[PDB]
């Protein structure tokens, strides 16, 4: 059906906070449909992004609907009633339905709140720093679960995600499964990852954290491919002229030409669930992958942690690889 993305007419931090928490509750509600969660989640990710806001366009055959503008929410908390403007096209029945979804949290959430701290939603969202700290903290928790263990303890210790706005584990898992089911959501996340990579926002604290998370997301499932290119092939080893490599060498030539052809889709094959992702799996070139692991076993200090029981691991071309890089 319709994917509803609400956006505001005001830079009011308290309104930006209420829309955030309203949308968070719709993603986590029992009764919402997938289309409601996808749009409520894209609204959250769009609040600190001017770019995603310009990407959500109804013009060209939209499954997306801006719903157009939302002035404010109902003033008394517990009234998650939206106030849209003229030319909005939202009927009262839908404002009550949305207000009812925001109160329909599962019982696994202590104190009927998505947060570990039961007094977070009750905070007065007066200043933009209180919102931006809250907005960045929960959005960061959604970025870690987008990926394919406890990096929360890392991100808490280092550049901030505020422990005050930690989500309860049940809220994180629900967000994780919505992002997995939502192809439309992950399609817009790539534009954020692309923007964090090409940085006119080096000083922006949010895109700096997105770019670090993006290091783990980008080229996920491509490790075996890039390690093979690095070791088996980064130098002209004379053992490359073995006839047993002749087939896999042309295979990697097509695989590398494939990476160039796809352009920027190549960085997000696992995130977009592209069928081409498996084409880069080491099982399509097990001899060279075996030859490259042996080279990197003796050349690099860090490859103690990676070589862990692969089924197609040859273990004979592994010994050929280490002996080739043994002496230079």
């Amino acid at each position: 059906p319709v994917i509803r993305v609400f956006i505001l007419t005001s830079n009011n931090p308290e309104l930006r906070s209420r829309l955030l928490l309203f949308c968070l509750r719709i993603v986590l509600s029992n009764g919402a449909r997938d289309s409601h969660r996808f749009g409520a989640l894209l609204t959250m990710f769009s609040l600190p992004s001017a770019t995603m806001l310009n990407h959500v366009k109804l013009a060209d055959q939209s499954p997306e609907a801006d719903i157009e503008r939302v002035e404010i929410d109902g003033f008394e908390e517990g009234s998650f009633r939206l106030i849209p403007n003229a030319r909005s096209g939202m009927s009262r029945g839908e404002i009550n339905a949305y207000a009812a979804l925001a109160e329909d949290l599962p019982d696994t959430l202590n104190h009927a709140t998505p947060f570990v701290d039961s007094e977070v939603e009750g905070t007065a969202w007066d200043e933009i720093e209180t919102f931006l700290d809250m907005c960045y903290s929960v959005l960061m928790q959604a970025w870690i679960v987008t990926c394919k263990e406890k990096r929360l303890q890392k991100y808490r210790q280092q550049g901030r995600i505020n422990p005050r706005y930690l989500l309860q584990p049940e809220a994180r898992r629900i967000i994780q499964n919505v992002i997995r089911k939502g192809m439309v959501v992950r399609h817009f996340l790539t534009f954020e990852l692309q923007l964090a990579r090409a940085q006119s926002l080096v000083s922006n604290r949010y895109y700096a954290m997105v770019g670090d998370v993006g290091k783990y997301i980008e080229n996920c499932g491509m490790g075996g491919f890039f390690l093979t290119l690095k070791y088996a092939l980064g130098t002209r080893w004379p053992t490359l002229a073995l006839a047993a490599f002749s087939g896999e060498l042309t295979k990697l030539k097509s695989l590398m030409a494939l990476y160039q052809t796809l352009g920027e889709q190549a960085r997000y094959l696992a995130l977009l669930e592209s069928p081409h992702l498996m084409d880069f799996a080491a099982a399509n070139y097990p001899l060279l992958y075996s030859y490259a692991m042996g080279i990197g076993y003796v050349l690099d200090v860090n490859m103690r942690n990676y070589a862990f029981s692969r089924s197609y691991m040859n273990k004979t071309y592994f010994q050929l690889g280490m002996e080739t890089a043994r002496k230079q």
């Binding site: 990579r197 290091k215 783990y216 980008e218 080229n219 491509m222 890039f226 290119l229 690095k230 092939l233 980064g234 130098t235 002209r236 490359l240 002229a241 060498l249 042309t250 990697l252 030539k253 590398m256 030409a257 990476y259 160039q260």
Partner: peptide, 19 residues
């Protein structure tokens, strides 16, 4: 762990001179 861009890891199609 992960690889940055600057995928200079395309020195290898010339590394395919043995073809």
């Amino acid at each position: 762990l992960s690889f940055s861009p600057d995928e200079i890891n395309k020195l290898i199609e010339t590394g395919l001179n043995t073809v």
